[PDB]
Structures are given as C-alpha cells and as structure tokens.
Design a protein around this ligand. Structure first.
Ligand SMILES: [Cl-]
Ligand SMILES: [Cl-]
Ligand SMILES: [Cl-]
Ligand SMILES: [Cl-]
Ligand SMILES: [Cl-]
Ligand SMILES: [Cl-]
Ligand SMILES: [Mg+2]
Lengths: 138, 138, 138
C-alpha cells in the first residue's frame, strides 16, 4: 500500500486548453504536501485549481518559469485516492512527447511524520483530431 | 472505512427494564470520546455500564434531565467494533416511537487528532408481548 | 491484525553453526523495539546481524550471559512482516528441546504510543543428519 503521486497525461492541438490533474493514490492521513510540477515549453499555465481532495484544504501555488510550486496543508488529513489539483494549460507521422515532471516533494502525515511516496510523471503530446482519445476515455 | 457511533434500538412494555448499548464501528485508535445521549420521557435511567471495549478505559457519566453525558478516555486506543457503554433503562393498533439521540460528540485519536464520525440514533417503542422480538433477535 | 514477534526454531548437530531469525508480523509503523532473547546453554552466540527490515535502522545488541539484549530504532517506521535480526549460533530415540525465549519487550510506534504485541518463542533441538529438515523447508 504505497502512497503515489501521479501527474496526468494528455494530448491536444495547438490553441486548445487542456486540464491535467495531479492525483494521489493510497494516501494515509497526509497533512501537508509541497511539490513542484515542471511542464514543457509547448504548454502555458492558465490556472491552477483545487482537486477532489483539497476543496477545503489550505492551498497555495506559484508559477515561476516552467514549474508550478504547490503547497497543500490540511489538518483533517487526506486519505485514499483522488486529485490534489488540476492545471489548466493552453497548448501554444512521427512526433515527440513531453514530460510533466513531479519533483522536490516534501510530504508529511498529520502527526508530522515523513511519508514515503513514489512518483509517476505525466506525458503530453501535441495531436490533431486524434480526439478519438476523448471518445476512448476509460 | 468511516467511524460510526450507533445508539441501539429497543422495545418493551411499561414496568420492564431494558439494556440499550451505544456501539462504535470501525474505530481506529480512538483515545477519547465525549458524547451526549438524549432519551425520551418514557424512559428512566437506572444505570450506565462500561461496554465490551471500555471495561478498562477511564469512564465517566453524568445523568442530567433527559440526557446522559458520557466521557471515555483510553491511552491504549479503541479500535474495531464493539459497545462503548450500555444504558439500563426502566420503561415508565397505531403507536409512536421515540429517539435515542447522539449529539455533542467530541472524539480524538490517541495522537490528539480530531476523528470524523457519523452517528446513528436509536429508536425505542413501548410494546406488549411482542417479545417475539427477543425470539427473533438476529 | 495483532503485531507479533516470533523467535525462529532450528535443529542442528554439535559443532555446526545455525542462523536463527527473530521476525515481526503485522508491524504497524513501529519506531522502537527493545527486547531480550534468551537462549539455551547448548548454544553459543557468534554474531547478531540486522534483518530484512532493519538494514538501515539504528541497531544495537549486547550479549550477557544467556541473553541477547537488542535495541532497534527507526524514524521511518517498520511495518508488515520480516526479520528484525538474525542470530548466528554455534551448537556446542528420545531427546529434549530448548527454548529461545523473547521477553522484556518494550515497543512503541513512531508517534511514541505503546504497541501491544504477542510473542512466540522458538525451539531448538540437537539433531543428526535429520537435515532432511533443510530438504523439507517450506
Ligand atoms: Cl507555494
Ligand atoms: Cl518529506
Ligand atoms: Cl461526563
Ligand atoms: Cl472532535
Ligand atoms: Cl542494547
Ligand atoms: Cl511498551
Ligand atoms: Mg503524534
């Protein structure tokens, strides 16, 4: 039962907005999380929103260069699976993919103990009407 | 896995004593509980006894008006399912039921964190030889 | 889900070395353990080694008379099942068995709470080529 933080993956054409979640899986009474999400040059941050687990948490973020620093604190504890936050991006046969990387993680439970976490990075690709991808979501 | 506190339900004729438990379900290292159990005018409190989980806890109760204030502290932690205490009451086609209500709950785990709990109230009815109810207990 | 500490059992002829683990089962974020393992006169301690769970714990032991005092501290917490340490012994139809006893246990989780544990002692016998026992290990 290992706590894992996961950046979502996505694909979209130039000019469109995408919503990419960062999720947690198997959280066990997490009380604070600080992390950095790095994103590719092809993306531009439009907004950062609380997720399904953090609607009532103390939530901060700061966008600097190609990274979003996010801070979450929640005296109730966060447990189980769900989104920590969503990033709204705008997208500015071969092809190449880009990483949505999670790093600089600092995570503690509500009793102040360090929590071991695994991380999984996201992948983003610029794509055409290949939004059969939306059609195939599952 | 949500911690729930549940007042038992019962039925009996005038003049008889009944034993109504207040139980906990899915407790996770609970260290202290304060609560109020309100009871109907048709009932009169004869005794308040420790339950299956609190035989060795620090246990206090105070009966004032139509409510029983109960305090439990236990440095070992209380976990799982079982009774917190039992109330011995004396009972003083249509018909009407009465609530055994749980409120004013204050509950913390052994590390001093607030515990989220759900509550379920009990129901009491004055009844005749409908103690096929005892016969059907299951 | 009760935390249990278990001394392993073994059999071997005079003159041979044996490796006996002391294991934990269903540990839940244990932060410190002190215990005493007592052993029979027919055994002599050659070494005491960290186990599968304590390779990176702070680990101390002291052999005095027929008992090994072991101290383990680990800020990460120890959870699940595995060995806490291994003792390398040298063995110095009827027959008689000997106890490898666990006692004097003091165990706390990473938040400093006392942990309830059960213990299971080990059994050692001097044996011949009955090391079909190794052949039958399972
Ligand atoms: Cl921040
Ligand atoms: Cl950390
Ligand atoms: Cl009280
Ligand atoms: Cl509370
Ligand atoms: Cl020692
Ligand atoms: Cl102890
Ligand atoms: Mg604590």
């Amino acid at each position: 039962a290992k706590t894992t933080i996961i950046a979502g993956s996505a694909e979209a054409p130039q000019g469109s907005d995408i919503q990419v979640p960062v999720k947690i899986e198997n959280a066990d009474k997490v009380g604070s999380i600080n992390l950095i999400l790095s994103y590719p040059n092809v993306l531009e941050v439009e907004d950062v929103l609380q997720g399904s687990l953090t609607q009532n948490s103390l939530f901060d973020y700061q966008v600097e260069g190609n990274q979003i620093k996010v801070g979450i604190a929640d005296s109730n504890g966060i447990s189980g699976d769900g989104s920590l936050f969503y990033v709204k991006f705008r997208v500015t046969t071969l092809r190449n993919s880009h990483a949505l990387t999670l790093q600089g993680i600092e995570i503690y439970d509500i009793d102040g103990n360090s929590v071991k976490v695994a991380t999984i990075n996201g992948t983003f690709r610029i794509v055409s009407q290949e939004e059969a991808h939306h059609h195939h979501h599952h």
